[PDB]
Amino acid sequence: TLNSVASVKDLANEASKYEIILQKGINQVGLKQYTQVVHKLDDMLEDIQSREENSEFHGILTHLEQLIKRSEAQLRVYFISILNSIKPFDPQINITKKMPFPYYEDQQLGALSWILDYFHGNSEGSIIQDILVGERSKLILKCMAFLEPFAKGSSGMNSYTEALLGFIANEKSLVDDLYSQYTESKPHVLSQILSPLISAYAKLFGANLKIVRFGFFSFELVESINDVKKSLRGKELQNYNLLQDCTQEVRQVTQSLFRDAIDRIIKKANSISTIPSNNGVTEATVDTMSRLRKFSEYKNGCLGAMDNITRENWLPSNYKEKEYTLQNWEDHNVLLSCFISDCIDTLAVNLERKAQIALMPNQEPDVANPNSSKNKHKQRIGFFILMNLTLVEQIVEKSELNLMLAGEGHSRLERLKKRYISYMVSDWRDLTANLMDSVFIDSSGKKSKDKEQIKEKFRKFNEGFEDLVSKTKQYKLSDPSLKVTLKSEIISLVMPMYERFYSRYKDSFKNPRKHIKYTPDELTTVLNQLVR
């Protein structure tokens, strides 16, 4: 009753009665009642120590001290037992079955909290906290152990991540459930439990990031680290430095993924020094589109990758403007479209460069220039590039690429095609220019009556016309829209001029039919047969 004035004999008797109660065990006594009895002993011990130094006094002091020690050890056993009521399990099952992870019942949470408070109340806060942390991190590590082995969208890194997100979320609920709302050590406790899990994640993450020797997997890894980082937002964490390192590293890889595609095209387009005799689709083109085709299957990744990765991050050091068809540069859609368009531009120009070197080994290539007089093979080179761009457009039209190029992209591709359509029409422009010049040079005084000089003008045109008709037959386009355009442009250039030329000089002869090989209608027939 009143410890300060009670005899050691009476206090001893009281302590003996408390030991009998405690001897029954926590469940029989009731947890709160049990800690209450230990408090009585603790307070009794304190009250009598604040008494003669004899064996009687020393005896009760030791008895109280040891009985308290044994009882508290039982509290720890009980604490650890409740924590281990949840056994390790394979998370993949819960995920597949769409069931929540196991969680302590409310009454168990109550008991856990009561014991934490008991020990925080008795200068053993760090001790019981280390036990809590130790038991939880061991359990979770065993669960994640089931996914560790197995770690598009087929990788085991996905599940491992999803599992980790559930554990991070559930440990947060646990700590919030176990302590008072503003308890200072909450973030620390959660950190100590989650950090080991993080280290384990970051290591496995580095493994895949190293196993990079196909490559688009990086997009799924970026998604992984992002999900983990956002789940850890607003949370104290000693390992956060690891995630950051992982982030900055995976970003180097995804960014290089784009720069690499460009360099890959430049290398492939220049690998084979010669051009196909039929001037058809090359493996560089086949490869380049398959690659872009795969890029388009990861719309989300590519777009996300567009954050802080300018156009100069994937283009060659001193790229040349004239070699591109580029005429908000912030959002990911415009940026990604530019990349695809830049890739197709690179393919076309590099195939052109190689073609020029192949047909004119000694000349410096002058690409993207339909008016190059130095380029004596524009018709063939134009055809060659268009045959490849034909496959390029087909693969765009049948994939996500079509939607990604929406607007700007398609217009750039049209600009690309017109350049090479222009290459094919260029030789015809020379023909008509030559004819026009011959007329001008001969029309400054009176109207010519020089029959010989006039026939010569028709003769030279006939030779130029026939030579071009012959060569044009060597290039057969497959795409109907390209053929229609080529047909329109050649006829539009040649016929109006020839009709005027023929009309201007036909009456220089008594019977034109005898000195002029083609009437406009005859010329028209030749051209129509050529264009068909």
Which of 263, 273, 278, 520 has the alpha carbon at shortest distance from 384? 278
* Residue 444 neighbours by CB under 8 Å, 6+ apart: none
CA distance 151 to 324: 42
Q: Is there a contact between 49 and 57 (Cβ–Cβ < 8 Å)?
A: no
Same domain, 132 and 217: yes
CA distance 146 to 160: 9
Task: Look up the CATH number of the domain holding residue 436.
Answer: 1.20.1280.170
Residue entry with tokens 């398609």: 410
Same domain, 438 and 382: no
CA distance 492 to 514: 27
Domain boundary (193, 221, 237) is at 237
Give kind and range of the element (H or E) at residue 91. helix 91-97
**Breaks in the chain after (C-N > 2.5 angstroms):** 50, 151, 213, 327
Q: Cβ atoms within 10 A of the Cβ of 319, count?
A: 15
Domain that holds residue 254: 238-405
Which of 35, 61, 67 has the alpha carbon at shortest distance from 48? 61
Same domain, 97 and 144: yes
Same domain, 399 and 252: yes
Which of 278, 287, 262, 269 has the alpha carbon at shortest distance from 353? 269
Domain boundary (41, 69, 86) is at 86
Domain total in the chain:
4
Angle at 410 between CA 406 and CA 411, to 5 degrees: 120
Same domain, 346 and 253: yes
Residue entry with tokens 């168990």: 108
Q: Is there a contact between 153 and 168 (Cβ–Cβ < 8 Å)?
A: no
Q: How many angstroms is the resolution?
A: 2.0
Amino acid of residue 231: S
Task: Look up the CATH number of the domain holding residue 332.
Answer: 1.10.357.60
Same domain, 44 and 151: no
Domain boundary (237, 265, 288) is at 237
Task: Look up the CATH number of the domain holding residue 216.
Answer: 1.20.1310.30
DSSP letter (8 states) at residue 309: -
CA distance 175 to 189: 8
Same domain, 269 and 328: yes
Q: Is there a contact between 145 and 88 (Cβ–Cβ < 8 Å)?
A: yes
Same domain, 392 and 370: yes
Task: Look up the CATH number of the domain holding residue 35.
Answer: 1.20.58.1150
* Residue 5 neighbours by CB under 8 Å, 6+ apart: none
CA distance 10 to 15: 9
Q: Encode 218-250 in three state secondary structure.
A: HHHHHHHHHHHHHHCCCCCCCCHHHHHHHHHHH
Same domain, 375 and 421: no
Q: Is 38 helix (H, G, I), strand (E, B) or coil?
A: helix
Dig out the tokens for 76 from the structure: 């720890």
Same domain, 74 and 131: no
CA distance 447 to 230: 87
Same domain, 71 and 96: no
Same domain, 109 and 176: yes
Q: What experimental approach yielded this model?
A: X-ray
